[PDB]
């Protein structure tokens, strides 16, 4: 079979890892590595780089000619443990060496997710995987977002031909969150530091107590920057097949039909994805397609865009 978005104007991709691999290229035409590209995955031990899981994602993407999103340079979970007790100047050299290592090894990255979750999970904690390196990037600084500016500056320097993206959750569910995120975007745009705006859109962001008109209005606000939008980590819970179907019909089209949205990435489709307990998967354990996926195939084929 051909992937769902084979003939569409924008990609429909998915998180990739061992449980998501079966049939993957028969459905999806873009990928993000689920975990292997977090800095704690590669450099759990200082100065030894375990590229195995990341190379698996990249090699599969290349073999299938599908765009690769590198996930993720800077984040507040799954960072190396040993960096937390280094002095800021040494932490900074480690961050710069990580950015150089990824750019050397992976020259064909389609979208570089430089910072994830600046509003929600900055690298300011000293718990397990917290990183504790905010100060190595200038901290909040004068603008309140110095460390985000410094992350993007490093990305521009080390990846001079690569599209750079910011990513976060719980953005389009609130005008106030959208306006906070756009202030970070505005600061970045003073130095032309960012090329794309990501919003995750997990299930907990799209519940029906916020109308879809709110999300659509906040997409229009994000689009007014002139930058492409990407939906990065989309999922809908499936306590029953029918709840999952109803939610896909309600929510998915608002993002898919938005003219400034240039791709959607599902955050898994088979059991073992992040929201496994909430049954967000679209294929059951016995390999059969759920009603939401039957619908999604037909909906996407009917909505190629441009």
Q: Which residues are catalytic?
A: 117, 233
Length of the chain: 306
Q: How far is the CB of 86 from Ca ion (least distance, A)?
A: 11
Q: Give 65-113 as a DSSP string.
A: T--BEEEEEE-SSS--SGGGGS-HHHHHHHHHHHHHHHHHH-TT-SEEE
Size of site (CB under 5 A) for Ca ion: 3
DSSP state of 288: P
User: Distance between CA atoms of 228 and 202, rounded to whole angstroms?
Assistant: 19
**Which residues in the 77-96 window bind Ca ion by CB under 5 A?**
94
Q: Does 47 interact with Ca ion (rule: CB under 5 A)?
A: yes
Measured from the CB atom, the residue of 94 and 247 that comes closer to Ca ion is 94
Q: How far is the CB of 98 from Ca ion (least distance, A)?
A: 7
Q: How far is the CB of 51 from Ca ion (least distance, A)?
A: 13
Report phi then psi at 231, rounded to 5.
-90, 115
Q: How far is the CB of 93 from Ca ion (least distance, A)?
A: 8
Measured from the CB atom, the residue of 94 and 195 that comes closer to Ca ion is 94
Measured from the CB atom, the residue of 98 and 234 that comes closer to Ca ion is 98
- Any idea of the CA torsion for 120, 254, 33, 116, to the nearest 10 degrees? -20
User: Distance between CA atoms of 234 and 231, rounded to whole angstroms?
Assistant: 7
User: Distance between CA atoms of 90 and 106, rounded to whole angstroms?
Assistant: 25
Measured from the CB atom, the residue of 47 and 286 that comes closer to Ca ion is 47
Q: How far is the CB of 39 from Ca ion (least distance, A)?
A: 10
Q: Does 97 interact with Ca ion (rule: CB under 5 A)?
A: yes
Q: Does 35 interact with Ca ion (rule: CB under 5 A)?
A: no
What are the angstrom distances between the C-alpha of 88 and each of 23, 38, 73, 126? 45, 20, 17, 14
Q: Quick one: how far is CA 238 from the chain centroid? A: 22
Measured from the CB atom, the residue of 5 and 102 that comes closer to Ca ion is 102
Q: Does 19 interact with Ca ion (rule: CB under 5 A)?
A: no
Tokens 């599902």 correspond to: 266
Q: Does 142 interact with Ca ion (rule: CB under 5 A)?
A: no
194: its two tokens: 């960012």
Please report, as ranges, the residues that interact with Ca ion according to CB under 5 A. Answer: 47, 94, 97
């Amino acid at each position: 079979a051909a992937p769902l978005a084979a003939t569409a104007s924008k990609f429909l991709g998915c998180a990739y890892g061992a449980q998501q691999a079966p049939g993957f290229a028969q459905y999806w035409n873009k990928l993000t590595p689920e975990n292997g590209g977090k800095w704690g995955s590669v450099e759990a031990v200082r100065d030894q780089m375990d590229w195995s899981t990341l190379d698996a994602a990249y090699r599969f993407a290349q073999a299938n000619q599908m765009p690769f999103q590198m996930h993720v340079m800077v984040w507040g979970n799954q960072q190396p443990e040993w960096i937390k007790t280094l002095r800021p100047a040494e932490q900074r050299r480690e961050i710069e060496q990580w950015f150089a290592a990824v750019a050397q090894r992976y020259p064909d990255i389609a979208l570089l997710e430089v910072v994830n979750e600046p509003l929600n999970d900055p690298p300011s904690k000293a718990d397990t995987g917290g990183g504790n390196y905010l100060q190595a990037l200038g901290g909040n600084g004068d603008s309140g977002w110095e460390w985000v500016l410094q992350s993007f500056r490093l990305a521009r320097r080390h990846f001079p031909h690569t599209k750079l993206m910011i990513n976060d959750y719980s953005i389009t569910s609130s005008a106030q969150a959208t306006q906070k995120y756009l202030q970070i975007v505005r600061l970045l745009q003073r130095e032309n530091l960012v090329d794309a705006i990501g919003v995750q859109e997990h299930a907990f962001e799209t519940t029906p107590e916020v109308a879809v008109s709110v999300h659509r209005d906040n997409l229009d606000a994000l689009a007014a920057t002139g930058l492409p939008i990407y939906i990065t980590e989309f999922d809908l819970d499936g306590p029953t097949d029918a709840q999952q179907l109803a939610d896909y019909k309600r929510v998915f089209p608002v993002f898919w039909e938005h003219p400034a949205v240039h791709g959607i990435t599902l955050w898994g489709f088979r059991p073992g994805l992040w929201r496994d307990k909430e049954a967000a998967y679209l294929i059951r354990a016995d390999g059969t397609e759920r009603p939401a996926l039957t619908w999604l195939r037909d909906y996407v084929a009917a909505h190629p865009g441009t």
